[PDB]
Design a protein around this nucleic acid. Sequence first.
RNA 1: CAGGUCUCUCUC
RNA 2: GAGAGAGACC
Length: 462
Amino acid sequence: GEIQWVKPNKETGRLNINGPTRTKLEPSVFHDVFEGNKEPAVLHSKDPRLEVDFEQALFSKYVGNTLYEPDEYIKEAALHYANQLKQLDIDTSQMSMEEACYGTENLEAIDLHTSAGYPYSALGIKKRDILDSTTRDVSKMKFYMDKYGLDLPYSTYVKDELRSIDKIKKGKSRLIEASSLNDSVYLRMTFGHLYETFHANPGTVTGSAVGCNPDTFWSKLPILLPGSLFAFDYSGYDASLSPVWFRALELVLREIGYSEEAVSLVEGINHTHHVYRNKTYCVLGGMPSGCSGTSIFNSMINNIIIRALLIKTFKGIDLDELNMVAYGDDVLASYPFPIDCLELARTGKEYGLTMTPADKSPCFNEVNWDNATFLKRGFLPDEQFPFLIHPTMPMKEIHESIRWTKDARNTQDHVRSLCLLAWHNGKQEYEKFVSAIRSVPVGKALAIPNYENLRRNWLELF
RNA sequence: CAGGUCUCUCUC
RNA sequence: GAGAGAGACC
Ligand SMILES: [Zn+2]
């Protein structure tokens, strides 16, 4: 992805868009009970903690574009995936606006505590002023659909979150590109059924993990991905996507029966306009971080990518022997013979993709179930029932989260969440965590899940 | 101060 | 089943 141009808002007649500049995050009552290296991300250009120009680092992610049109490997890759999707019988028909706004069994309603985006978030209009969960009123939506229309600018803010320190000195905070409610609604109308199917079907048919439940999904992965594992990390996946991958996506959506009107919407996320503060810019390539279908579209593109890489990198690759699961840029995959990702990464490079060894390994080693991660969690066979697989969030990550809070009113829920994550690491580790929590006054005030009960509840999920 | 998923907590 | 919160992940 590449920034094409940057004009003042005056020249473009776009409204200014300013986000918060002070972090909501404060050290929690556990900040000095647990070790951690992470601090709230740099939000503002005159942060004492900085060591580079802020805005420079912000948009460094857009590393450029290599390919703009699918070659033969990508075309063949697109087709193999779309064929695999055909057995899902995705409803290519347009979802109703009442449904697209207020949700279904398999697609959550549009979030209403959240910004309506351009231009409403500059005209003091909330989504609570356009939508009513209780009415399912869609009439006022229709109206604004027509006033402001489609293909509105995204609204660029900086993400409020913990970051490792190098990323704080080096200023590489992340960006939130807020879609307009208009585009969200229309995108949900166009692909809502696709969202539904994907959510209802995490696994190796969609090749997506969106909608999985890691407590239970983790036991199926060694069966869904038989054979030899491979894995790797991207840098700036979303931003690094060149327009070819959206061309590629278009092929898949077409092959599974989408009308050319529908397919025509992909160009609208490949080529986007963004307002950040007092300026307007253009991005060609790159997945807009906050458009409808980000996770699903990134997951599909990843499925196109992994196939293209294999058959352009190796001889006699049988794509049918490929199993993979993706959640955005995160991938786990298997093949009947080992795959050397050093070679995939070299091919990746030609495609504008920067692929590094899995989990910040210095070099591409072998990936096995004993060191694989997916969604940050490991794989750990239960000691009693070796076929039940524990997802293992690393305690290190769990301690990074507990040392901060955005509202200490909600400490209870926060610590309870972390325990649901921590117990999988085993009894010993968990009781170490709990008693560290208890080691502090409000820690003795919290209701903490019993390890035995967590386990018992887990076993009963099966 | 985006898009989502999952899980939990609270209430009718 | 519906409203209200939170947390993690992508
Ligand atoms: Zn443009």
